[PDB]
Design a protein around this nucleic acid. Structure first.
Ligand SMILES: [Zn+2]
Lengths: 134, 47, 121, 74, 38, 52, 52, 123
RNA sequence: GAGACCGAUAGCGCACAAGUAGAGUGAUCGAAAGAUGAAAAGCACUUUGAAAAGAGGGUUAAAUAGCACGUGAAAUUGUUGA
RNA sequence: UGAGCCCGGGUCGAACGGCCUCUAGUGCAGAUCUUGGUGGUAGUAGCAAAUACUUCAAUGAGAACUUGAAGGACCGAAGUG
RNA sequence: AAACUUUCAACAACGGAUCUCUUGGUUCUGGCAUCGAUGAAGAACGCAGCGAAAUGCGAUAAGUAAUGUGAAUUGCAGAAUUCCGUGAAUCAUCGAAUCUUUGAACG
């Protein structure tokens, strides 16, 4: 149950903030889980999605389709996986919007910033694991 | 002297002055017919 | 056609004027030849405009830094370099003046200040 | 006509003979305002326009009207 | 009339500009609700 | 709100007209002009016994 | 007219005999710059203006 | 969608028009005149109405309507010549005939099984 | 931050480019107006039509959802059946 | 008994009901009631004066009121300039 | 017998009720004290590659500097980012700037 007075449980305010969030906030909302192999390797559960990552869709009509992320369309909270497309009437292919919560990251695009992101999440997880353990 | 205009035809539902009237006028209706009978009845009973 | 703000900070006044002049001359020539066959030259002109704004900001910033050093130990400063705050805050008594107290008041507090005490239960 | 454009408020409410705006009273320093018309007050009240400067005040208050630059900036 | 001023000429220009219809690429923006000029 | 249904200028047309004696919005350039107001039976009018 | 003549001379190296200006209805200014007999407008337009 | 939903679309041909700027009352009467007829007979009739050789009987909407001898064929005195309504009906019959050709039906055996006129939002 | 409140004729005049459109010489007066679909995937192509559109064909779970777009009552109207 | 309640069939797509208490902006045919929509009248009344229009060709899917030419009329310098 | 008038049913119209929904309103409570001649509130005109309005900004004009984040914006077109980096972004923060004509309005 919410305790801190600065937190709000209003449906009206939560939906307003979610649909009017800035781009920086939307990046956090557009996170996706990491694969099991990546979890035991980095001690990290989730991470915001980005363009270079490779994902496996685990929810929706595209049952177990794998591919690399092509675009992070933050304006409508969707990502574009490669070769996950549908043909229009004219036969031109358009991407299908997949939500990050419906995919799992299998390969992670690595750069100095994202190694810093993974290190900070791991530091907190190991801190409380030993705090809870002993 | 006062021109009585019946609120029918082109005079039905008009905010202000009817067209073909010159001076001091007065509009009437059926609704006022029942009223004028009421005040006359009250005055006659009290007189 | 885009300049970096980091490079401009190291460069000095004479170099900055040369860059500003060559950016404006480039924009003037580009604009007249842009009226026909608009395209990839459009965003170059846009990048030129932001470059001109960047150089103007750095020139103004360096000049104000020199002036603040000049007016560091002077009684009066230009209104542009004076703090803004608000109109009421500007008219408010200074911290030194509002903290000034009478000598007789100071003597009483010097010899009879509030003490620390406790009462047993 | 009887009314021309007023420079202060932009309405065609400046009397040509009296040279006084029927809406704001331009020659007078104060803006015309009456408590028997609440609708008229809220048409020209603060917040019905651009709010060029007063919109920037609250952010400066939140940080204490501080002056200077962040430490280590370029 | 024929006699006018540059300032009122500029205002007359603005009134023409506001009468311009709606561009088609506006109507295709995501989240758009504007259909016809008012 | 205490001003709900009250922030309008309306006046009854009179008795001699073949219309209901209800306050009607003045003006003449809107859909609102000539419409009833101030009544609990009227659209966009004051409710009966406003909650306090 | 003086500013336009000086701008043309100093920047694009164009000498003008006279300049006639009008303000277009939209609010922009149009300048008719007649050049000296020595120079050719067609040659200048092709080279320095990219105009055919 | 169509109102006569008991007809299989594979064995028939259909045409439709919406928000047509013609008189509803005039169009209703002339549609009723050609109801149940052959396609070619209706086309010849509608042309004759334009040239005032045949007249459309006015059954329901005939208040204070003139009398002619051309109405004697229908058993009424009040008949008229809705030229505008006939032109619109010709276009739809031609369109339905074209749709029948594409499907492969026989135009010499087609009949107007269902013809309906409804009202549009008013201008 | 909340509600034993109102739920698009309600709730502020304004859930929408609302003190806007519009009316008045002026002071002032002052509206109407939300909802396709999970995703535009907003109908390629063929055919008739001058066109608007229609018919096939197609997208979709659904076009008995085609932007006159959730559901779609009554007054009123057309066709068919008695 | 009644106000009403329940089920079947069709349409539809995302929330709802029974029991018992609490609560109220809680029940309409009328108020020349308010707003919105829709009828009969009705394809009816009606579509005025400025004498006046006609022939061929062109455009165009479509020409009494669009154009070219020709004819017949008119404003008549206080003009239909 | 048909046609016409009326009643009911099915389908289709007109119209927008009913159900469902809500980045809105309304009421209550809590923390805090901040407009302006260093030119306010209001009015006007400009500014986008393709924009009328709303919105943002002011000839540095849908913006500049600084800080943080860390790879976008997106309706289309064109540039990016080398990603092992002073660095995308209609991003957030914000201490530095630019800030047209007026308006207490001041040659
Ligand atoms: Zn004024």
């Amino acid at each position: 149950m919410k305790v801190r007075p600065t937190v709000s449980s209003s449906r009206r305010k939560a939906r307003k903030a979610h649909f009017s969030a800035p781009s920086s906030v939307r990046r956090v909302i557009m996170s996706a889980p990491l694969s099991k192999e990546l979890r035991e390797k980095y001690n990290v559960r989730s991470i915001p999605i980005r363009k270079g990552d490779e994902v496996q869709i685990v929810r929706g009509a595209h049952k177990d389709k794998e591919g690399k992320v092509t675009s992070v369309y933050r304006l409508k909270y969707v990502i574009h996986v490669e070769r996950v497309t549908r043909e229009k009437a004219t036969g031109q292919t358009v991407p299908i919007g997949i939500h990050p919560s419906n995919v799992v990251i299998t390969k992670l695009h690595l750069d100095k910033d994202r190694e810093n992101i993974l290190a900070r999440i791991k530091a907190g997880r190991e801190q409380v694991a030993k705090a809870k353990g002993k | 002297q006062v021109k009585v205009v019946k609120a029918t035809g082109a005079n039905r539902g008009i905010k202000g002055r009817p067209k073909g009237v010159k001076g001091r006028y007065k509009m009437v209706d059926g609704r006022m017919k029942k009223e004028m009978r009421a005040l006359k009845r009250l005055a006659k009973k009290k007189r | 056609g885009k300049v970096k703000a980091g490079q401009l900070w190291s460069k000095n006044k004479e170099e900055l004027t040369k860059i500003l002049g060559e950016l404006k001359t480039e924009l003037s020539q580009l604009r007249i030849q842009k009226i026909s066959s608009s395209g990839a030259k459009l965003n170059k002109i846009h990048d030129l405009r932001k470059s001109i704004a960047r150089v103007l900001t750095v020139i103004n910033a360096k000049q104000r830094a020199q002036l603040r050093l000049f007016y560091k130990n002077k009684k009066y400063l230009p209104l542009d370099l004076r703090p803004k705050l608000t109109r009421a805050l500007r008219r408010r008594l200074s911290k030194e003046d509002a903290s000034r107290v009478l000598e007789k008041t100071k003597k009483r507090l010097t010899h009879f200040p509030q003490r620390k005490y406790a009462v047993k239960a | 006509k009887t009314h021309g454009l007023c420079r202060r408020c932009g309405r065609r409410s400046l009397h040509n003979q009296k040279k006084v705006c029927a809406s704001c009273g331009y020659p007078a320093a104060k803006t015309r305002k009456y408590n028997w018309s609440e609708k008229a007050k809220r048409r020209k009240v603060t917040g019905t326009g651009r709010m060029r400067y007063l919109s920037t005040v609250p952010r400066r208050f939140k940080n204490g009207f501080r002056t200077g630059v962040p430490k280590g900036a370029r | 009339p024929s006699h006018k001023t540059f300032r009122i000429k500029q205002k007359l220009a603005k009134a023409q500009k506001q009468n311009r219809p709606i561009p088609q690429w506006i109507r295709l923006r995501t989240g758009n609700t504007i259909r016809y000029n008012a | 709100s205490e001003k709900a249904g009250h922030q309008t200028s309306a006046e009854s047309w009179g008795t001699g007209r073949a219309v209901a004696r209800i306050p009607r919005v003045s003006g003449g350039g809107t859909h609102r002009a000539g419409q009833g107001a101030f009544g609990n039976m009227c659209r966009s009018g004051r409710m009966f016994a406003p909650t306090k | 007219k003086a500013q336009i003549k000086q701008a043309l001379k100093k920047l694009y190296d164009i000498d003008t005999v006279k300049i006639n200006t009008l303000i277009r209805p939209d609010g922009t200014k149009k300048a008719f710059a007649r050049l000296t007999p020595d120079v050719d407008a067609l040659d200048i337009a092709a080279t320095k203006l990219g105009l055919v | 969608r169509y109102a006569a939903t008991e007809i299989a679309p594979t064995k028939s041909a259909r045409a439709r028009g919406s928000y047509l700027r013609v008189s509803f009352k005039n169009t209703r009467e002339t549609a009723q005149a050609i109801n149940g007829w052959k396609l070619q007979r209706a086309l010849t009739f509608l042309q004759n109405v334009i040239d005032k050789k045949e007249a459309v009987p006015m059954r329901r909407y005939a208040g204070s309507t003139g009398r002619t001898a051309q109405g004697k064929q229908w058993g009424v005195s009040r008949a008229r010549w809705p030229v505008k309504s006939a032109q619109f009906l010709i276009g739809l019959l031609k369109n339905a005939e074209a749709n029948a050709d594409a499907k492969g039906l026989d135009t010499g055996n087609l009949i107007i099984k269902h013809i309906q006129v409804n009202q549009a939002p008013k201008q």
